[PDB]
Structure formats: structure tokens, C-alpha cells
Design a protein around this ligand. Structure first.
Ligand SMILES: Cn1cc(NC(=O)N2CCC[C@H]2C(=O)Nc2cccc(OC(F)(F)F)c2)c2ccccc21
Length: 228
């Protein structure tokens, strides 16, 4: 997260760190007792690496009573996701058992009504991604509040030049932004999950290249099918 602040520890009990061989790789969001949603590109060339999900965390490194590292029974990328596109960039991770719930670990309600978030709506995105251009990695969860950017602006040639489909949304990226390592994490608006940070390499903090988020409401039936 660029231009953000250290999050209040455990105030986002849905927040997941998706880890590969013990290192933070991507954000994710607990959406059911046994299921974490993230981005499909996260597991590109993950091969047979050990994929785990850390729940209940603030610090990646320090002991906390609510922190638990879960193994993953199933990783389910969206069938239409592809390495060279930003489309359908969702991943569902089935934990090896249902998560132990409490004040620091709780699924987030998620949007099923397929209607756009209004431009200017202030939404929260959190993550353990890089916090500066040097690539400094924070030990603890960071967050930033970002206004939703209208799709027409986001689609201007100067911005993302027609790439933003009805299944995607954008947020402003003027100094405050998601960045490398924040992919897969949640964009939350009014206490409901609306977006998942896409996992394509994108310059961070430049107003001319807004953040892109997959609209969870557009994939409601897919999320349901995988859980079933
Ligand atoms: C906006 N933005 C999104 C990008 N993509 C992206 O993050 N990923 C693609 C799928 C995997 C994930 C990733 O690279 N994770 C990763 C890798 C190494 C360390 C690490 O820990 C960390 F963050 F440094 F603390 C995290 C991305 C990449 C570059 C620039 C902007 C970028």
C-alpha cells in the first residue's frame, strides 16, 4: 500500500495473507468459514509450492493469539483466467478445515447485487504489499481509503484505454494506491466486499493509471458454484 497508514490491529478480521513457502505473496479475504478469495495470477508459476493462508494476523512475523496459518485443501482459479489478461482474475482457496472464528477472524459479507459502486464512494483496501518505490515490505497490515473512479474516466486512452469491462471497477491512484503484494486483497465499501485487487503489474501511485479491482458481484454465481 502506498500513501497509507498502519492498520488498527485486527480491525479487519476478514483480512488474509496468502503465502507461498512461508512468505507473504498476495492479499485475500475470508468470504466463508472455509474459503478465502484472492486473485488468480497470485498462483501463477506457484507450481507445487506450499500455499497457505494466514488469518487473524496483524504482524507477519510476531506471535499473536488470533494468528493461525491454515493449509489449503483446494486452489480454484477462475476457469476463464489467463496469464496475459486482467479478466476473471479470481481465485478461491479452500482451507483444510473451517477457520476458528472470533473477534479477529470473521468472514466479510460480499456483494451479490450486480450494480456498480457509485463514483466517489470511499472504499478501504488493506494489505502487506510494498510501501515505497524501493520495495520496502511492511511487517504489519497497512491500509488506505480510496474513492471509486467512474468507468468512463478509467477507460480513457490516457488511463486504461478501454480495458475496464463491466466486470471490473477502478479506484483513484493519486499518491494513495494498492501496490505489489496487495493483489488479491479486498476493496471494501460500506462494510461489504465489492472488489478484489487485480494482480497485473501496474505502476503504483500515479493518478493516470488507476487501481483496477475485479467486481465480486459480477462473479456471484461462480463463487457459489465453487463452494458447492
Ligand atoms: C499493483 N501491482 C500488483 C502486482 N502484482 C502482484 O503483486 N502479484 C502478482 C501475483 C503475485 C503478486 C506478487 O508479486 N506478490 C509478491 C511477490 C514478492 C514479494 C511480495 O511481498 C511483498 F509484497 F513484497 F511484501 C509479494 C504488481 C507487481 C509489480 C508492481 C505493481 C504491482
Amino acid at each position: 500500500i502506498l500513501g497509507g497508514r498502519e492498520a488498527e490491529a485486527h480491525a479487519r478480521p476478514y483480512m488474509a495473507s496468502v503465502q507461498l513457502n512461508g512468505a507473504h505473496l498476495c492479499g485475500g479475504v475470508l468470504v466463508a468459514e472455509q474459503w478465502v478469495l484472492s486473485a488468480a495470477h497470485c498462483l501463477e508459476d506457484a507450481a507445487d509450492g506450499k500455499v497457505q493462508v494466514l488469518l487473524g494476523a496483524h504482524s507477519l512475523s510476531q506471535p499473536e493469539p488470533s494468528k493461525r496459518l491454515y493449509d489449503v485443501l483446494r486452489a480454484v482459479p477462475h476457469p476463464d483466467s489467463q496469464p496475459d489478461t486482467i479478466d476473471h482474475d479470481l481465485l478461491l482457496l479452500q482451507l483444510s478445515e473451517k477457520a476458528t472464528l472470533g473477534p479477529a477472524v470473521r468472514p466479510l459479507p460480499w456483494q451479490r447485487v450486480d450494480r456498480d459502486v457509485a463514483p466517489g464512494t470511499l472504499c478501504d483496501v488493506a494489505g502487506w504489499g510494498i510501501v515505497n518505490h524501493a520495495g520496502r515490505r511492511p511487517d504489519s497490515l497497512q491500509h488506505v481509503l480510496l474513492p471509486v473512479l467512474d468507468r468512463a474516466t478509467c477507460n480513457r486512452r490516457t488511463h486504461h484505454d478501454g480495458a475496464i469491462t463491466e466486470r471490473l471497477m477502478c479506484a483513484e491512484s493519486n499518491r494513495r494506491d494498492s501496490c505489489k503484494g496487495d493483489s488479491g486483497g479486498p476493496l471494501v465499501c460500506g462494510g461489504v466486499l465489492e472488489g478484489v485487487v487485480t494482480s497485473g503489474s501496474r505502476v503504483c501511485g500515479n493518478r493516470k493509471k488507476p487501481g483496477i479491482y475485479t467486481r465480486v458481484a459480477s462473479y456471484a454465481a461462480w463463487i457459489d458454484s465453487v463452494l458447492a
